[PDB]
Every structure is written in C-alpha cells, then in structure tokens.
Amino acid sequence: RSRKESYSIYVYKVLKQVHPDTGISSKAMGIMNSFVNDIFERIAGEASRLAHYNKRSTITSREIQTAVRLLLPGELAKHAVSEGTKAVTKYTS
Amino acid sequence: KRSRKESYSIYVYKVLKQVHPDTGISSKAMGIMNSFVNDIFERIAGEASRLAHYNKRSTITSREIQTAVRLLLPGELAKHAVSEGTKAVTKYTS
Amino acid sequence: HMALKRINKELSDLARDPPAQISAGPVGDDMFHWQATIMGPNDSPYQGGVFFLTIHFPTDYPFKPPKVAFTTRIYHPNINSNGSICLDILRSQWSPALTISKVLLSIASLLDDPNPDDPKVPEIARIYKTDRDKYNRISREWTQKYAM
Amino acid sequence: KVLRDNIQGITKPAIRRLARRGGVKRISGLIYEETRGVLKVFLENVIRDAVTYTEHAKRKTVTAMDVVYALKRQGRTLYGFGG
Amino acid sequence: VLRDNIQGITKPAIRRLARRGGVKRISGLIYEETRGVLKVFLENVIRDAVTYTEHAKRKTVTAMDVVYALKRQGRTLYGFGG
Amino acid sequence: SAKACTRSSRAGLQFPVGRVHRLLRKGNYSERVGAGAPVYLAAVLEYLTAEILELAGNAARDNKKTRIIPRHLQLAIRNDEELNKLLGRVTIAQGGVLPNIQAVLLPKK
Amino acid sequence: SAKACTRSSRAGLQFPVGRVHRLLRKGNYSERVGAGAPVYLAAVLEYLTAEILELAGNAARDNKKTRIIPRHLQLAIRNDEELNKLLGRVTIAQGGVLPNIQAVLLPK
Amino acid sequence: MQIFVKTLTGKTITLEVEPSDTIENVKAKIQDKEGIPPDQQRLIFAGKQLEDGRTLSDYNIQKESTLHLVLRLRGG
Amino acid sequence: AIPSLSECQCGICMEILVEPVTLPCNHTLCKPCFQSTVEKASLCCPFCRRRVSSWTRYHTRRNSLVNVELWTIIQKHYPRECKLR
Amino acid sequence: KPHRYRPGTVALREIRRYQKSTELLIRKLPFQRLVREIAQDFKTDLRFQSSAVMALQEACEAYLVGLFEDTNLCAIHAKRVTIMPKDIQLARRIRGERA
Amino acid sequence: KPHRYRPGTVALREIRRYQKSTELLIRKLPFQRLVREIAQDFKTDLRFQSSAVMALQEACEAYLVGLFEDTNLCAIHAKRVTIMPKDIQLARRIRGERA
DNA sequence: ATCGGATGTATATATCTGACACGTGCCTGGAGACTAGGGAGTAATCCCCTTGGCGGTTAAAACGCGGGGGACAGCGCGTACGTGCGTTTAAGCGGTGCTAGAGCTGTCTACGACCAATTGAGCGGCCTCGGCACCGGGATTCTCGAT
DNA sequence: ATCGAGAATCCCGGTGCCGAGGCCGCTCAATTGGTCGTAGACAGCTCTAGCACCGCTTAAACGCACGTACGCGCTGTCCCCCGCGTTTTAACCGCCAAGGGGATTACTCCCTAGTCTCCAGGCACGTGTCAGATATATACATCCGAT
Ligand SMILES: [Zn+2]
Ligand SMILES: [Zn+2]
C-alpha cells in the first residue's frame, strides 16, 4: 500500500482542546481536511505572488502576514496576525 | 540610463504588419495588447504547472500546455489554438 | 500519392516552356528527387558560372515546401559552405500555390543581388557591406576556380 | 448501449422538491422545462472538464477527484470528497 | 485634512453615468444609494492598494498596486501595466 | 525557546511544522523558504480550525448531540458573519440550507 | 527542420521562443520545463494576438481611421461571442460600452 | 611529411607539410585540397584549440602525430 | 452563363472542385486542399495571402463552408467528373 | 364533511420540513443514467466511480437550490409569489452566467 | 410658443451620445480629493501617482456603468421605466456583493 | 372572538447495530550537525516627479418653474395551480459472478539541467513628417404643434 | 392617414501640431557545444471494484377532479422628474518653484540549501462498545368551518 498523509490527528487534538466531550464523524473529518488544504493553498499562493512582485526569491514571515491581511476579513485577519506573531516570537526564543 | 524593460511590443507590431499591411497602432493599444498577452501567458502557465503537479510529474511537456489550452479557451478557439500549436511543434522538431 | 500528379503537371510545365538559364530534371525513376543547373546572370559578378543543385520532394506536396541544396561551391552571404540557402520563400514564405519554376527563379534573383538583412554568414556579410570591390574580387577568384 | 431522453428522469416532483427547499411557495407550470435545460447545460459544462482531466492522465474511469477539481476550476469549490 | 467630500460626486455626474448605462428615467433617491455604493467600492479597493504599498516599505501608491488589487478582486484592468 | 524539544511543541502549536515546511519546499511556491514562514502559517491554520470547531461544537450541543455532522459545520459557518464571507463560494456536502422564509409569503394575520 | 538558425524562425513563429522559455523556467511554475513547451505556448499566444488584431483593424477601417485605438479593441472584443466569453471580467481602459438600448424604452 | 588527423568525417588526407609553416598557410592548403575555409577549420592538438596566428612548431606537431579536426559550423 | 471546364478546376490539386469553399477574398478551392492547408499551411489564402481565421471560425460553427449552389452546378452539369472522383 | 387544508399551508409546511433535512432530493438511478449519457456523448466507453456520481449530484443540487432562491427573490420583487421562466432568465442574466 | 421637446426625447439623445464616446464622466479633482480622503483614513501622509488615480477612476466608472445597466434591467423587469433604490439593492444582492 | 374536531408535529422509552475511539507494529519522513555562497540588509547619491501656489476663462453646476407623463392604488374576471385520492411504475435493497483497469515494481535509456565563450537581437535615445484634432460653413434628418 | 418651422446631427474643406515610426549605438541574454544524473516509458503482475444480472417490496410518481385565489387588464388620481432659462461656482490650463523619496550601486555577513546519519511519529490494520437511528405509544400546537 501507499501512505496518504492528512491533518487528522492534529484536528482531533484541537477539537479535544476546545470541546473535551464532543466527537466528530468521518464526513466532517474529510470536510475539515479539505478546508485546511484550501486555506493552506490560498495563503501559500498569495505569499508566492507577493514575493515575486517585489523581485524577491524567499518567503519570510512578513509575506505570510501580508497575505493573511489580504485574504481574511477584518476581525479574523487581526486575530490571525496576532496569533501568528505570538507563535513566531515564542518560537524564535 | 534607465534599466532595460522587456515587452512584447515589437512582436505585436510584426504580427499586426503581417495581418494588416498598412495599419498603424497607438501606444495605449500597444500597452493593452501587452497586458493581454501577459495575462493569457500567466493563465496558461499556471494551469499547466498545476496540472503537472496533479499527476506527480515534474516536467511541463507540450501535452500539459495542450490540455491547458483545451481547458481555458472556449469551444472554437480551443480547436484552432491546438491545431496551430501542433503545427508549430511539428515544424520545429523536423 | 496525390502529390505525384502535381509533380506530373510541374514537369510538363517545365517541359513546354523551360525558363532562361535554369533547367531541371529527375535523376532517377522516382520523381521526388530532382537536379537542376543554373547559369550565372549577365548583370552579376558570376559571369559564366555553372552551378548544380538538388531538390527533395516531401511526401506531402505542395502543402509542405521542398528542400534545396547546392552540390557545388559558391560564395554568397546567404549560402553556407554545405549549400544551405536562407531565403524567405523556402521555409517562411512558402505557399502551396507556388511552383518549382518560381522558387528556381527566386534563387536566380537572389544570385543577382544579395540580401543583407538576414545574412547566413556574417563575416562575408560585413565584408560585402564594407566595400563593393572586396566582394567583387572575392567573387572573381571564387567563380573562375570553382564554377569553372 | 446508447441512451435516449433520460432528462425525463428529473420528474416534476423532484423539481418541486428542490424549489420547496429553496424557499418557493407557489410554482408555475413552465418552470420544469427551464429547470431541466439549465441542469443539462450545467452538467455538460462540468462533465466536459471532468472528461478532459481524466483523459490527460491516460485513464478510462473518471475519479471523484477529477470532478472535485473541475468544480474548483469552474468556481464552485466542493468539500467532502478529498483534495 | 478633508471632510464631507462624497458630495463631489455631483448629480449630473451620476445622471451621465446612468445615461451611458442605458437608463431613460431616474428617480430622486438614486443619487444617495449610488454615492454609498461608490464609497464602499473605493474603500474596498484602496484598502488592498494601501496594503500592497505598505508591504514594499514605500510611501507612494503606484499604479501597479491598484492594478494588482483590482486583479485580486476579480476586476482585471488593462492599460496601466501588468 | 529551549531549542531541545520537537519543533511543533517548541512553538506551542498542535499542527505540524515540519510537514508544512516540506509542503512549502515541494509546493513550487518560491525558490527559497524562510525559517519563520511555516510557524506563522501553522498558527493561522490552527486558529481558523479552532474557531470553526468551537462554533460547530456549540451548534452540536444546541442540537443535543455528541458528534459533529456536516449539518453542524454548515450551521456554524453560515450563522457567523466573517466565516460566511470567507467561505462564500464553498459548498458543503450534506449541508442543507438555513431556514428562512420571506415575510410576504407568510399568511396574513 | 534544419538546425543552425534562430529558434523563433525554425517553427515559423514571430513571438520569441527563447524569452518564453526563460520566463517559463525562471517563472516558478515547475521544477523542469520540457523542450517543446515554449514553442507551443508561443504559437498559442501569437495566434490569439493575430485574432485580436485582425478584428481590431477591421473595426478601425470601418471607422474611417488608419490607426488602432482602444475603442476599436473594445468593439472587436465585445462583438465576438468567443472572445467576449474569454475576456469576461476584463475591463479595457478608455474602451466605452457597446451601443444598446432596450426596446421598451423606445418611443411609441 | 604526412599528419594523421581524426576529423569530423574521420578521413585523413595525405599532404607533405612542415611544422615550421604557419596555421594560416596550412589552412589555405586544406582549403585547396579539402575546401574548408581557415575560419571554419579548427585544429585540435590534445584537446587544445590552436590560434591561426601561431605555427605548428609551437605546439610540437611531429611526424604522423595523431591530431583531431572540428569544423566551425555556423549555419546550415 | 456557364463557367469554363478548365477554369473550374482547383488551383492547388489541378482537378475539379469537390465541395467548393468560397473564401471572403472570393477565391474558390476544393475542400480537401483547403482542409489540408488549414491543417499544415500558414492559415492564409495561398494566392492573396490574407488571413481567414475569423471567417473560418464563424463559418465552421454553422457549417457554411461549402458553396451549395456551385456544388449543385458542378454535379448537375458535369456528373461524370464527380463520378470519376 | 372531509377536512382539507386551505391552498397554501401545505406548501409552507413542506418548506419548513425540507429546510431542516439534509438528504438528497433526486432519485439516484435517473441521475446516474443521465450523467452516463452525457459522458458517453463526450467520450465513448467511459466508466464512473460511484463517488464521482455522488459529487456531481451534490454540486448540481446545491446549484439548483441557489438558483431557485434567487428566482424567488426576483418573483417577490415583481410583486408576485409565483416564479415564472422570466424570473429564472433574469436571475441568470444578472448573475452573469449567460451575459 | 417657444419650442419645447416632449419629456422623453432628450434622455434618449443623451443615451445615444454617451454610448458612443469614451471620455471620463466624473470630474477629476473631486474624485482625487475623495480618494485622498479615503487613503488618509487608512494610512496617514500618503502620496499618489497620477496613473494610480486614473486607474481608480476608470475602474469606478466601469463598475458604476455595469451596476446601472443591471439596475435598468431589473426596473424594466418590474414593469417600470424609472430606476429605484430597491432595484439597485436587488441587483447587488443577486450579484453577491452584499447578499 | 371563540369554540369543536382533526390533523400533524413534538416528546418519552426499549433496543440493537455498525461506526468511532483506541491499541500495536513499523518504516519512512523528520530532526541534528556541518559546510559554502549567494541573497538580502545597509549606507550613500542622484534626479524624477509629486506637492504646493496664482491668475484667468469659461464649461459645468446650482436653482427655480411649468406640466405632462408615469407610479400606484382599487376592482373585476377566470384561469391556472394547489390539495386530495386511487392507480401504475420503477426506484431501492440483497445477493452473486466476472473481469477490465487502477496500482505497484523493476530496467534503463534518452531528455533536460549546468557551465563558458560569444555575438547579434532588442532596448534606449533622437528626429521628423503625416494622421488626426479642430474650426467654420452648409446639407441632411428627426421632432412636434396643427391640420 | 399628412405639411411645415425650429433644431440637432452629419459632410466637407482648410490649417496646424505632436507623437508614431524609423534609424543608430550598444550591452547582455540567448546560442552552441559538451557532460552528467535521474525521470518516466515500458513490460509485467496483482487484485479492487465497476459492471451486469435477478428477484421482491413498496415508496414515490402519475393521472384525474374540484375549487379558489392570484395574475392580469383596466381606470382614475396626483405628484414628481424633465426640459429650459438664468445665475453662481470652481474645474481646467498654463506657469513657476521646492524637495521627498524612488531608483541605482557598492559592500558585507549570515541564512538557507545540500549532505549524511539516526530514530520515533504517524499510518495501516484490527477490535470492542455505545450513540444514534428506529419502532411504538401519548401530549400538545395548529388549522379550518361555524357561530
Ligand atoms: Zn484541390
Ligand atoms: Zn484569397
């Protein structure tokens, strides 16, 4: 057989972190996988276009931040930027 | 002097002289044609790159470009563009 | 197949009224292969020049152009040593309505005067555009020792 | 094994059911033919791209991923079938 | 500083746009709605334009930023670059 | 940070970071990929997933169930304002539609 | 075809094969680019450009002008079903709109 | 004095020359016998390209030394 | 009147017209030659060298390439020529 | 003597019931036969995965539901409760599907 | 005694005139000032290239012309000749700009 | 404004079944250490173009008035669609059999990436003359009040 | 059905100006030649599931009849855009002047790709059990005719 990667265990961990009691079915799990893939592809493509637009050749954190500010609506954009910068700051030290 | 900026101006002018032997074209129309060519190039190249990534391939072969042309263009432009591309490749390889 | 009949009419057209200073014919049984002889035009630096060339007919004619090659040696900016010829009608401006007589007379016209916009050989091209006399005498000691 | 006039399989009660889900109280008598035509056009548009996708890969069975991908290209992203 | 400038989109300047669009008769309340929707559309485009400008550590909104924002929104524009 | 634990645990994230890095490398997005991009991207993905899961769990608890079915996801996405705009073009399988009837069609008083 | 001549003329095209090849290779589309892709892509682009320009020139001649201007481009694009379908969302600067008045508004 | 050369065609042409001769003159001799112009000729001595200005004795060409030839093919 | 027998033959294949196609540049050639040219030639009229691509795109959807009246004339007036095809 | 509802309340009850459920609203076999007919019209001798047919049916049902919602909005805007083919045509024209 | 055109024959003349020309319809400086106001609302002390302002004006004019075309179509559908705010709202709702 | 049937929907209880949550083997992908070089950060300079200001002139906007055409409400007709019942049709479910085609593995050969010398295609700057903009006069054609 | 006056639009001829097309100098990117590592083309084998058939329920579809309520045409009222004339406001053009920051260049350093080694995190497979669906029997909200 061939191993097929997925975001299953991580989404289950997040669900248990938020709602320790409720479960999740298989169809909802596939829907969440598709949603995560779609958002990933959108943000990565926007970051790539932004990097190419400024005659650059790398994707740093700021390109991802600008892509997030472009894509997500207002309040979601602010919360996502705050979470991302917090994670990067905690990671770098 | 100013750094070199590339454009499709001279080739579009050559094609225009090939179609209409005695018709000129303004600057704004040149800019519009340049933008149109760039946009279509970006569309076809991006679709072909995706479709190559789709089947775990690594090369953008003329098959991928042909499929992207069949997808993006409408009914008749698809057939004519495919025929022209096949003609060009056949004449180039031999 | 269908091109064989077209070759028949082209041969008949060459037969009834052959053009001036040029004559072509098939070497063997197959009508695809042809060879032709061309004289040096009077208003040219190739006086008394005799040249031979070969013609290849693709299986899809006239929808595709035929191939030409100089089996002899000639000095010209638009012809290489091996005999390859770079003219517009051969590969870029070829149409099915054209005939072998037309391409032969176009070749003769090129031999009358060169085309400097698209030189196949650039060194003799800059030699020719430098001054006329150098091209003159180089064509001299090329044509009276190769053509004759 | 040819097929004919299978569009009649989308009967009047089925279109009535769809409109009832949509939020429609009263339905005219000429809606059904228009609905069938619209559905046929949409199916042709999606299936052409799906068949192109499954033909580029040198296969003979259309895969659900191909349909998902044709829908995504056409502008109607679909969730729940992979990707 | 500027304030109360949406009134610059004058009543004849909206009548002319409607005339180009193919409108024969115009009600007396169209102008306010048109001003509102125009302001919303401008705000939506200019936000992305300013974000593009701010990313490049610049201070001038070039035409390329506006063209890129319009292309992102799905309203591709021809003539000013690309 | 400590620079001794796993990368995902080091950043405080539950989503993988190495997998995101590999996807960025092999995704043909840029010739080079920075060392801080995967962390930011994983944080954004995890936040969005957490928010949608919280709303779906709220809907499921409202409907007296212990599992999240696609209907709960559809309700959670549509009822919110930001998420609905984000997923405006997305169609959820087995999602149905929100209950709304125009006021004109209702019977008169 | 015989080698030892510029690439754009080997296939009979006018658009630059080399420039298209460089753009495809360094444009960050795929790891490797085949040797036949640029020729096909250049042929498609040249075909489309010729299609646009022929109709634009026809409209310009119909307008008693010997120079193509964006109004002629818009008239050529919007009067063809296939091209209008292709360039649906695109806005041509200084292109105007097609003449069209609804029959109901006409005087009776 | 004859020289063995592995040309592109592989044919070795017998001709009496001397190492003291210049490259231009031997190239002209080849053009007289083989027709290849001096610019088109490119003699190869142990993988080294010889300039036309110099002579054969500079790279020490000896009796029947196995050399190579490549034609500078531009066009055709 | 009636067209001459010699003038009617195709200028490409030197033989009678079958399913003739009338170009917008009022040049007539038989459908096999026209199809072979559009497949392999430079998408131009061989004689006057003008593009027919937009015309071909328009006419191929409605299947109006063939000239019905000239085809009827050639088959009725010269049936044996069509039979020997 | 027999009790029959006023014309209209049954439609409202069906609307309320049908906006709560999530199953599919078209019979499986006729839709499968129709999609097979279209496919074999495009390319002969084709085979279909079951999931592909299910995905096609789901997409078509969602699109039709959205179209009917827009048509109902148009019909109510025209000071009517019934939907007519001109409502569907206008909705398609505004959405830009047919231009 | 003075010659007055009937109400209706002048608007059609304006429609015929404006659908043939291509110049910009809104005045330049008021539009530029409004754009600068919005920009300073977003970020303070910005500068604008004239090409950017022209592009913004072109996009806005094209969008408004399209919106008025759809509004007129809806108004004609509603058995009227006058365009009303509800027409604009319905066209925007169907096009998906506000839902 | 009720009041009675009568109908459909909502609620409480047993049960049983298949999908979800968890446990285990393992192997492939991720982590750790080290090296080289180019991409990007930073400082400095130039000059392009953006902002600001004045004066004029005049095309466009603001305001007001008379009125006619269009929006909107009210009524009446009848026809098409909703609701219910009996009947015919084929969807739905289970069970079995067959093989075409998806999927995986092993060889290896030819296509594409890399690098260096080289030169001509294409870009920047100049210049000029013709195509288009503009003005002024006249011919042509819709428009409307009056017959 | 029409004739004619007032007004807008199209044609034609002459003058002028600025930008589009061609030319010259030059620099750098495409070309050509050669080498090398690996991607996919092909042959072969496995085995999954897509297709075809058959029988039995019974649920959804179909056709018909009755009635009513809503779509549509018609009329009447009134009020609000429209067309035109007059006055006020600021847009547009040409002009000058200052400097901010975009664009380019040189230098350096440190951040990431590439390679090798190693090991454990996640995937495939298997198993138990309980959450939800279904059947069955009451309780209540709601609708419609009749006072
Ligand atoms: Zn013929
Ligand atoms: Zn012709």
Q: Count of domains in chain D?
A: 1
Please list the residues that pair with K55 across neighbouring strands: none
Termini Cα distance of chain F:
68
Catalytic residue among C86, C98, C121, C138: C86
CA atoms within 13 Å, Cβ hemisphere of I38: 21
Tell me how far apart the alpha carbons of residues C3 and C121 are, in angstroms, rounded to a whole number. 34
Candidates G29, G60, G70; nearest CB to B45: G29
Place of tokens 């409108």: E23
A1 belongs to a structural domain: no
Rg of chain I taking only CA atoms, in angstroms:
13
Q: Classify strands I21-22 and A58-59 as parallel, antiparallel or unpaired.
A: unpaired
Q: Which has the closest alpha carbon to C81: C34, C48, C123? A: C123
How far apart are the C-alpha atoms of I43 and G54, rounded to whole Å? 13
CA distance D76 to D65: 14
Query: Is H70:H39 a contact under the CB 8 Å cutoff?
Result: no
Characterize the bridge pairing of strands I28-29 and I21-22.
antiparallel
Rounded CA separation E45/E63 (Å): 12
Among residues C82, C58, C70, C74, which one has the least CA distance to residue C3? Answer: C58
> Does residue A2 sit within a domain?
no
Q: Which of G91, G105, G106 sits opposite K62 (nearest CB)?
A: G91
Axis crossing angle, helix E30-55 with helix K50-77, rounded to the nearest 10: 140
- Cα–Cα distance measured from residue D14 to residue J31, given in angstroms and rounded to the nearest whole number: 11
d(CA D65, CA A40): 18
Q: How many other CB atoms are found less than 10 A from the CB of residue A17? A: 13
Residues 14-43 in C contacting H (C-alpha not used; CB under 8 Å): none
Subset of residues 45-74 in chain J with CB less than 7 angstroms from any atom in strand L? 45, 47
3-state SS track over B51-71: HHHHCCCCEECHHHHHHHHHH
**Within a domain: D37:** yes
b/e code G2-18 from CB counts within 10 Å (16+ = b) = eeebebbbbbbbbbbbe
Show which subunits contact F, needing at least 3 CB pairs below 8 angstroms.
A, D, G, J
Query: Residue A39 in contact with residue A50, Cβ under 8 Å?
Result: no
d(CA G70, CA G49): 15
Reduced to 3 states, what is the DSSP secondary structure of residue C79? strand
Q: How far apart are CA J30 and CA C1, in angstroms?
A: 52
Q: How many CB atoms lie within 10 A of CB A32?
A: 27
- Tell whether B7 lies on the interface with E, counting CB pairs under 8 A: no
Q: Print the SS3 string covering J15-36.
A: HHHHCCCCCCCCCHHHHHHHHH
Quote the domain boundaries for residue D16.
6-74
Task: From residue I60, give the alpha-carbon distance in Å to each of B77, F88, G85, I36.
Answer: 12, 40, 18, 15
CATH number of the domain encompassing residue B64: 1.10.20.10
- The b-or-e profile of E43-67 (16+ CB within 10 A means b, else e) is eebbbbbbbbbbbeeeeebbbbbbb
Calculate the CA J89 to chain-centre distance: 15
- For residue K11, with 0-12 CB atoms within 10 Å meaning exposed, 13-18 middle and 19 or more buried, which class applies? middle
Percent of chain E that is helix, strand, coil (3-state, to 5)? 60, 5, 30
The answer to whether J56 touches D44, Cβ cutoff 8 Å, is no
The two structure tokens encoding residue E43: 């705000």
Across the interface, of C80, C86, C92, the residue whose CB is closest to G12 is C92
Q: What is the CATH class of C2-147?
A: alpha beta
Examine residue E79 and state whether it is found in any structural domain, yes or no: no
The distance (Å) linking the CA of K23 with the C1' of M93 is: 18
Q: Report, in ranges, which bases of strand M sit under 7 Å from a protein C-beta.
A: 6-9, 19-21, 28-34, 39-41, 49-52, 60-62, 67-72, 80-85, 90-92, 100-105, 111-113, 121-125, 131-132, 143-145
Whether residue C73 contacts residue C144, with contact meaning beta carbons closer than 8 Å, is answered with no
What domain count does chain A have? 1
Domains along the sequence of chain H with CATH: 5-71 (3.10.20.90)
Domain annotation for chain G: domains and CATH numbers: 7-96 (1.10.20.10)
Strands (DSSP E) contained in K1-99 are 47-48, 82-83
The distance from CA B81 to its chain's CA centroid, rounded to whole angstroms, is 10
Task: Please give the method by which this entry was determined.
Answer: cryo-EM
First to last CA, chain D: 33
Three-class DSSP category at I62 = helix
Dist CA C38 CA C68 (whole Å): 13
Angle at I67 between CA I62 and CA I73, to 5 degrees: 150
Interchain proximity A54–E56, CB inside 8 Å: yes
Q: Would you say the C-beta of B2 is within 7 Å of strand L?
A: yes
Check whether domain J49-99 has CATH 1.10.20.10, yes or no? yes
Sequence letter at residue A15: L
Domain range I5-83, CATH class: alpha beta
Which single residue is written with the structure tokens 């390439």? I65
What are the backbone dihedrals phi and psi of residue C24, each rounded to the nearest 5 degrees, phi first? -130, 155
Count of C-beta atoms within a 10 Å radius of residue D25: 22
Give the H/E segment covering residue F18.
helix F18-26
Q: Where are the domains of chain J?
A: 49-99
Instruction: Using alpha carbons, list the distances in angstroms from residue B25 to B30, E64, I51.
Output: 7, 24, 19
Q: Which two tokens stand for residue C120?
A: 């196949």
D40 domain-assigned: yes
Please give the distance of CA J23 from its chain centroid, rounded to a whole number.
13
Residue G32's φ and ψ, nearest 5 degrees, are -130, 145
Residue of F nearest to G29 (CA): F28
Q: Is the dihedral of CA F84, F89, F92, F98 positive or negative?
A: positive
- Report the largest interatomic distance among the alpha carbons of chain H, rounded to a whole angstrom: 35
Phi then psi for C71, rounded to 5 degrees?
-80, -15
Give backbone dihedrals phi and psi of E61, rounded to 5 degrees, phi first: -85, 100
Query: H/E element holding A84?
Result: helix A74-92
- Measured in angstroms, the resolution is 3.7
Whether E81 is covered by a domain: the verdict is no
Range of A33's domain? 8-92
Find out if CATH 1.10.20.10 is the number for domain K25-95.
yes
Q: CA–CA separation, D24 vs F104, rounded Å?
A: 11
Is E16 within the bounds of a domain? Answer: yes
Q: Is C86 a catalytic residue?
A: yes
